Design a binder for these strands. Structure first.
Lengths: 150, 98, 96, 206, 79, 114, 127
RNA sequence: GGUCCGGCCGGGAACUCAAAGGAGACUGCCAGUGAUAAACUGGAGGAAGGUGGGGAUGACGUCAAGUCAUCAUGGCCCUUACGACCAGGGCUACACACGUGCUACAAUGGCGCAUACAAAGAGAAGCGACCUCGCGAGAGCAAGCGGACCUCAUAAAGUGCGUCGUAGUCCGGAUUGGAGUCUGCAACUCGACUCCAUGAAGUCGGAAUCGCUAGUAAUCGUGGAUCAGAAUGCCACGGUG
């Protein structure tokens, strides 16, 4: 409610050691079976070699670029009815949010297996594909697209 | 070597009841390897407070059974025959088995 | 608890002792692989109330069969009172 | 309901058990049982004996039993009357050599039990609850003590609408475990209903 | 279907069927113990069952060997 | 080709695809291959006349398909024609084993009749 | 000589013995790679070690037995970090900075009457 | 140090642990804000901060809230009977609905084999070893422990390999049939479980709605009360998170 502290410092990736990738595995994690999450994403994250052939590291961030929004809505119980006054999105959630769309939509892909069903999505991310990239504009069509209230 | 056990419901009695042995049952004759505490047997219980209805009631009780070993490590006669001279304690199970 | 009910149990004990408790043991032999005589199996029906399974305990204080605990033989609230009144040796609230 | 037993809540500290002894699931079952029969009976033939508590020690097949009473002499008997009877009555009731040591109650106006059994008895004597409840209990404040909360159930006086009463002196912080309080109940089956009562005597702090 | 070794039957009806066959046949014999089993010798006999209110006719058949008598007697009312 | 007639289980492990027959199970279809030598890791195709057909030999021991069901439907009726509780419940689509027909029994009774 | 370090966390019991030399590590007659190696992230045990150049530094003879992987691995880390502090009582600041010197007081939770899992309260869609 | 490699045996009170007693946390100390107050915000030191985490503890009274069915009890009722005994039947009925749950709908998976880690607990008409039989539930024989000695108990997730490849399946198990075990006079009505066969609905669920702020939710097992023997319920424990 009124509580005001700090964020929960997360433990970096099991290898590259990166908070950005840390909360990534967590957002992807399920049933506290964190192990699988690693062995499911950490693989597809490197399986990019077969998909490219180099130091697959920045590919992740570059892939998220096509999935990084900067405007969202927010209904407000004002003016009798309910406003929508859209507002941008700070970095703290930008990177986070995206990760959800990248995973929460990579599951309904319906491919070989979550391990790979995820990999492909990354390539589709930077190359614009799947609901992941969709959600962006499908969301932007509200904010910045309806500044009439913003 | 005769082994002695003391299992009371608290130290308020298990204490004096045990120190007695080490003091009396252990002078010079009896050897006594030492007074040990041993793990306590915790038995709690949950009882429905309200009479009929209100499942969300319940009350939790428990009876800690405190125990002690010690046991004398010397089967003599002059000192191993000065323990029977102790049978007080309104509640201190003393299983004097060998 | 009723007065009649709180009486039957009492008897269900006696009979389930004077007989089964030591006598059933006899037929329990034949009626079991101890080499199952029909007669012995039939003789098993001489009583009825005489059985260690026909007892529903019932509160040792009042009689309420619901909420029994071999430990105090009482039923819920009874254990509750006896406990608070310290009537029960070494037994206080449990918290951890 | 919404109050924890001001006695059991403290059964751990500052409050001894009115029946301290060991036992295992085996006899424990019938053990606390006999204790009830003997304890329930010791009151039947010693009601007016003005008995407070009734502890029950148990070493090995020989329960002690201590009948605390404001009136020891009457619980003694004609130089052996009472004692003999009880001490013998504990026969098959426990099937063991049961003794019996009486304990004299100092200041019978600070002990819950008594102050409770009394007020209730006065009620049965056709007396105004308020008077006794207040004065006939106010004494606990004159012989010392610091705080005493009384409580009379409903149906007091000619009325179908049961009502509880207050009346308290000093301080009775029953929300303090290190407080130690003398709480006890007492009924009074009168012409109608069962006007109850609860005595809360705050005997010092820690 | 719960006795393994020792197909039990309520003696009450036991002594009767054996008595009936003794003198041949006759009218049904009142019976309250359904928990028994349709005995073989009872083949083509008459038995009853106190289903709570009253009894019910019972005519054993070849197949009726180790089945429970009660099975042939309903209980609750319906439709 | 169909062993016990009809239904050609092809392109799958033996035992696993063997259970295809309306009569054998994970265990049965397995217990037969043992005394048949035919492994499970072998697809019916991989087999040969002296492999797939051999299976059709030790299969005539158990009852299967059509008549197996009929022989049962009739056997059921045998005890069901009798005025026994089971039958009385079997001819009404009610649980005859020991369930609470009073509620929750869709697959048992059938569809919903609100 | 040797330097002991208890260490524990979440019903765990760590027992690491640091000897001068021999970067070999054994936990209950097993390898740090044969008991933990190739797990969720048992790279924490040897974390404080490398944290200050190990392997060709000292030795680690552990004897843990309490709690699951995560915990049993956390206990050791606590014992070790605690241990090194003995060989040099002037490196506390460093280890404390990371947060090893401190123990994970954050233990399990106790279920509660009325609830269904100490916190998970039963639902009542209709109220 | 000696090994009939197991702390098995001397031995050793170090260590884990056990469990009685102690120290420690107080805005105590540093800085800034605040009127140079209460307090707040960070900080040092620590294993642990700002009632350390969780319990326990429920003011005055409200709902003529609940319980005469645990018990007690005013009044009213019944008494060759709304008292009492037995047998069988019923409380498990359906022709629907509403709430609380368990298990799914699957490859963050099943399945085979292999195998690593924990806690808190029960137990003389008890827990039951080893061993023998049986496909198996379980049975025969019979030790140990009335307990940090023994037994119920030789965790699951997990990790290694391999497989099956998005179909109603190698998913999911309801149903039914066949035949069997163990409790107990006795399991038709109306029991738990084993084996074989059968293998449905269900491909994640509108309107609407619930819990959860950290070892939490999430999921994975373990135990116990009641109890002869009917647990997915309740109480409780720990793993991963």
């Amino acid at each position: 409610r009124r509580r005001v502290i700090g964020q929960r410092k997360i433990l970096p990736d099991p290898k590259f050691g990166s908070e950005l990738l840390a909360k990534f595995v967590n957002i992807l994690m399920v049933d506290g079976k964190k192990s699988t999450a690693e062995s499911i994403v950490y693989s597809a994250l490197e399986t990019l070699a077969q998909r490219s052939g180099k130091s697959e590291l920045e590919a992740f961030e570059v892939a998220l670029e096509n999935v990084r929004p900067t405007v969202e809505v927010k209904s407000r119980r004002v003016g009798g009815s309910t406003y929508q006054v859209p507002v941008e999105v700070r970095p703290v959630r930008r990177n986070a949010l995206a990760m959800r769309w990248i995973v929460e939509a990579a599951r309904k892909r319906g491919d070989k297996s979550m391990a790979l069903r995820l990999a492909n999505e990354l390539s589709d991310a930077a190359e614009n594909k799947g609901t992941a990239v969709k959600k962006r504009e499908d969301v932007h069509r509200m904010a910045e697209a309806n500044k009439a209230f913003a | 070597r005769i082994r002695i056990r003391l299992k009371a419901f608290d130290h308020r009695l298990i204490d004096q009841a045990t120190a007695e042995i080490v003091e009396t049952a252990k002078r010079t004759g009896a050897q006594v390897r030492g007074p040990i505490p041993l793990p306590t047997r915790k038995e709690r219980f949950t009882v429905l407070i309200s009479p009929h209805v209100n499942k969300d009631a319940r009350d939790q009780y428990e009876i800690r059974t405190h125990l002690r070993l010690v046991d004398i490590v010397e089967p003599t006669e002059k000192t191993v025959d000065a323990l029977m001279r102790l049978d007080l304690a309104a509640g201190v199970d003393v299983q004097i088995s060998l | 608890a009723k007065q009649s009910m709180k009486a039957r149990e009492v008897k269900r004990v006696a009979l389930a002792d004077k007989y089964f408790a030591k006598r059933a043991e006899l037929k329990a032999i034949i009626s079991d692989v101890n080499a199952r005589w029909n007669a012995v199996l039939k003789l098993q029906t001489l009583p009825r109330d005489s059985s260690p399974s026909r007892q529903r305990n019932r509160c040792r204080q009042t009689g309420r069969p619901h909420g029994f605990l071999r430990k105090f033989g009482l039923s819920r609230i009874k254990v509750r009172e006896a406990a608070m009144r310290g009537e029960i040796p070494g037994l206080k609230k449990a918290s951890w | 309901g919404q109050k924890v037993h001001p006695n059991g809540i403290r059964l751990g500290i500052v409050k001894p058990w009115n029946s301290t002894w060991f036992a295992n699931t085996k006899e424990f079952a019938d053990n606390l049982d006999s204790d009830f029969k003997v304890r329930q009976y010791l009151t039947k033939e010693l009601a007016k004996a003005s008995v407070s508590r009734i502890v029950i020690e148990r070493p090995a097949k020989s329960i002690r039993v201590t009948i605390h009473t404001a009136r020891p002499g009457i619980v003694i008997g004609k130089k052996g009357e009472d004692v003999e009877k009880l001490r013998k009555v504990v026969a098959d009731i426990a099937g063991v050599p049961a003794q019996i040591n009486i304990a004299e109650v100092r200041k019978p106006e600070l002990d819950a039990k008594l102050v409770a059994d009394s007020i209730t008895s006065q009620l049965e004597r056709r007396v105004m609850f308020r008077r006794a409840m207040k004065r006939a209990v106010q004494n606990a404040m004159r012989l010392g003590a610091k705080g005493i909360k009384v409580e009379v159930s409903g149906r007091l006086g000619g009325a179908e609408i049961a009502r509880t009463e207050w009346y308290r002196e000093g301080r009775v912080p029953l929300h303090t475990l290190r407080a130690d309080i003398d709480y006890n109940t007492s009924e009074a089956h009168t012409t109608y209903g069962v006007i109850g009562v609860k005595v809360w005597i705050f005997k010092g702090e820690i | 279907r719960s006795l393994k070794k020792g197909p039990f039957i309520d003696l009450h009806l036991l002594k009767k069927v054996e008595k009936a066959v003794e003198s041949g046949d006759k009218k049904p014999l009142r019976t309250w113990s359904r928990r028994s089993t349709i005995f073989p010798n009872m083949i083509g006999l008459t038995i009853a069952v106190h289903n709570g209110r009253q009894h019910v006719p019972v005519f054993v058949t070849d197949e009726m060997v180790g089945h429970k008598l009660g099975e042939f007697a309903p209980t609750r009312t319906y439709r | 080709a169909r062993i016990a007639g009809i239904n050609i289980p092809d392109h799958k492990h033996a035992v696993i695809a063997l259970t295809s027959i309306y009569g054998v199970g994970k265990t049965r279809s397995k217990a037969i291959l043992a005394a048949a030598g035919i492994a499970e890791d072998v697809k019916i195709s991989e087999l040969s006349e002296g492999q797939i057909d051999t299976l059709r030999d030790e299969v005539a021991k158990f009852v299967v398909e059509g008549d197996l069901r009929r022989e049962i439907s009739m056997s059921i009726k045998r005890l069901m024609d009798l005025g026994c509780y089971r039958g009385l419940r079997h001819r009404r689509g009610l649980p005859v084993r020991g369930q609470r027909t009073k509620t929750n029994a869709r697959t048992r009774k059938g569809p919903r009749k609100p | 000589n040797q330097y002991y370090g208890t260490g524990r966390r979440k019903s765990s019991a760590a027992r690491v013995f640091i000897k001068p030399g021999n970067g070999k590590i054994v936990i209950n007659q097993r390898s740090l790679e044969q008991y933990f190696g190739r797990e969720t992230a048992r790279m924490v045990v040897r974390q404080p070690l490398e944290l200050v150049d190990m392997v060709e530094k000292l030795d680690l003879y552990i004897t843990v037995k309490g709690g699951g992987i995560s915990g049993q691995a956390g206990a050791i880390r606590h014992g070790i970090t605690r241990a090194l502090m003995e060989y040099d009582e002037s490196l506390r600041s460093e280890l404390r900075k990371a947060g090893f010197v401190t123990r994970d007081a954050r233990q399990v939770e106790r279920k509660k009457v009325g609830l269904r899992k100490a916190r998970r309260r039963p639902q009542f869609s209709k109220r």
